[PDB]
Design an enzyme around this catalytic site. Structure first.
Site, PDB file in Angstrom:
ATOM      1  N   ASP A 181      13.352 -12.471 -10.442  1.00  0.00           N
ATOM      2  CA  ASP A 181      13.317 -13.805  -9.821  1.00  0.00           C
ATOM      3  C   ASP A 181      13.756 -14.901 -10.802  1.00  0.00           C
ATOM      4  OD1 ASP A 181      12.451 -12.973  -7.223  1.00  0.00           O
ATOM      5  OD2 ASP A 181      10.634 -14.180  -7.275  1.00  0.00           O
ATOM      6  N   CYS A 215      25.570 -13.389  -3.623  1.00  0.00           N
ATOM      7  CA  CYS A 215      24.166 -13.550  -3.987  1.00  0.00           C
ATOM      8  C   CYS A 215      23.643 -14.687  -3.113  1.00  0.00           C
ATOM      9  CB  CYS A 215      24.037 -13.769  -5.498  1.00  0.00           C
ATOM     10  SG  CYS A 215      25.217 -15.020  -6.209  1.00  0.00           S
ATOM     11  N   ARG A 221      25.052 -14.484 -10.197  1.00  0.00           N
ATOM     12  CA  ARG A 221      25.086 -13.014 -10.237  1.00  0.00           C
ATOM     13  C   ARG A 221      26.430 -12.459  -9.756  1.00  0.00           C
ATOM     14  NH1 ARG A 221      19.122 -12.297  -7.363  1.00  0.00           N
ATOM     15  NH2 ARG A 221      18.111 -13.879  -8.712  1.00  0.00           N
ATOM     16  N   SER A 222      26.982 -13.043  -8.694  1.00  0.00           N
ATOM     17  CA  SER A 222      28.273 -12.583  -8.180  1.00  0.00           C
ATOM     18  C   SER A 222      29.358 -12.695  -9.249  1.00  0.00           C
ATOM     19  CB  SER A 222      28.662 -13.409  -6.952  1.00  0.00           C
ATOM     20  OG  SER A 222      27.817 -13.163  -5.844  1.00  0.00           O
ATOM     21  N   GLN A 262      26.306 -19.228 -14.034  1.00  0.00           N
ATOM     22  CA  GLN A 262      25.550 -20.468 -13.802  1.00  0.00           C
ATOM     23  C   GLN A 262      24.703 -20.920 -14.992  1.00  0.00           C
ATOM     24  OE1 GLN A 262      23.676 -18.981  -9.970  1.00  0.00           O
ATOM     25  NE2 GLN A 262      23.903 -21.124  -9.378  1.00  0.00           N
TER      26      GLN A 262
END
Ligand SMILES: O=S(=O)(NCc1cccs1)c1ccccc1
EC number: 3.1.3.48
Length: 283
Positions: A181, A215, A221-222, A262
């Site tokens: 998370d 994502c 994440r992508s 990110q």
């Protein structure tokens, strides 16, 4: 510089935030006028994440052709990817329309439907064989065929039917279920194992349309997934693998979608994954 020793040099000097901010400063800025039209407000999950006009995927519809999705075309590596946001309640039909129209074989999902107590994307595939889904706005039917649940990821076989023509196709759903998370994984080993399973399926290969990867926003994440894949492929293709520059590859990918990777922690994790992956490829 090479990668593994540039890596230890940034760790010892603690300068990951400065490296990452340089990337943000040098990244491309292209218009995203279609994303910002008022009629598309409920087609975007986040107001600050939009596809560029020049690389956006168009739906084959004359009313409204918009979806928050981008074509990332990597010329030297000879790989293409579609990066998109997690579908919204009012875009699940558009999502499967895109999969159909672009002739994709695989969908790669890097988030859970609920994370941090909030919904990160719609429940856009069926969970039981006998309870199929019909998307009336785009005239598609989607059925769960089989499901294989492993410790770090799940693979599903799905059948997508175009109800207008009665054509059917098999779609593979690759779901990485264990990204934490907060932060990034401690070891890249399970993420690399997952990447290799997607590769082995044929979903990334030129005989199919581009893989669809998402994502929640379709940039973090992508971005890590396609950056690691492309860097490892270039290391196999070139005479000098140490010439592959992960920062330059990332800036190339950011010509096609804003914001890829990110956080500085995601940047460090991408380096770690490529470094460890390059040893397994050989030995
Ligand atoms: O020498 S590399 O740039 N690549 C080695 C490979 C050859 C063929 C596929 S991968 C390297 C080594 C270890 C850590 C990071 C980069």
């Amino acid at each position: 510089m090479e990668m593994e020793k540039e890596f230890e040099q940034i760790d010892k000097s603690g300068s990951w935030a400065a490296i990452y901010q340089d990337i943000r400063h040098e990244a491309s800025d292209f218009p995203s006028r279609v994303a910002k039209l008022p009629k598309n407000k409920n087609r975007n999950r986040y107001r600050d994440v939009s596809p560029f006009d020049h690389s956006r995927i168009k739906l084959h519809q004359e009313d409204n052709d918009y979806i928050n999705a981008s074509l990332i075309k990597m010329e030297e590596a000879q790989r293409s990817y579609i990066l998109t946001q997690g579908p919204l309640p009012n875009t699940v039909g558009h999502f499967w329309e895109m999969v159909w129209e672009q002739k994709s074989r695989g969908v790669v999902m890097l988030n859970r439907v609920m994370e941090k107590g909030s919904l990160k994307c719609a429940q856009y595939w069926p969970q039981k064989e006998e309870k199929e889904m019909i998307f009336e706005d785009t005239n598609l039917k989607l059925t769960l065929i089989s499901e294989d649940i492993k410790s770090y990821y799940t693979v599903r076989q799905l059948e997508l039917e175009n109800l207008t023509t009665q054509e059917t196709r098999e779609i593979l759903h690759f779901h990485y279920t264990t990204w934490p998370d907060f932060g990034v994984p401690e070891s890249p080993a399970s993420f690399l194992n997952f990447l290799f399973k997607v590769r082995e399926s044929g979903s990334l290969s030129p005989e199919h349309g581009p893989v669809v990867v998402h994502c929640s926003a379709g940039i973090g994440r992508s971005g890590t997934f396609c950056l690691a894949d492309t860097c490892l492929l270039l290391m196999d293709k070139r005479k000098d693998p140490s010439s592959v520059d992960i920062k330059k590859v990332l800036l190339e990918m950011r010509k096609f979608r804003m914001g890829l990777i990110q956080t500085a922690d995601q940047l460090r994790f991408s380096y770690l994954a490529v470094i460890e992956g390059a040893k397994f490829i050989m030995g």
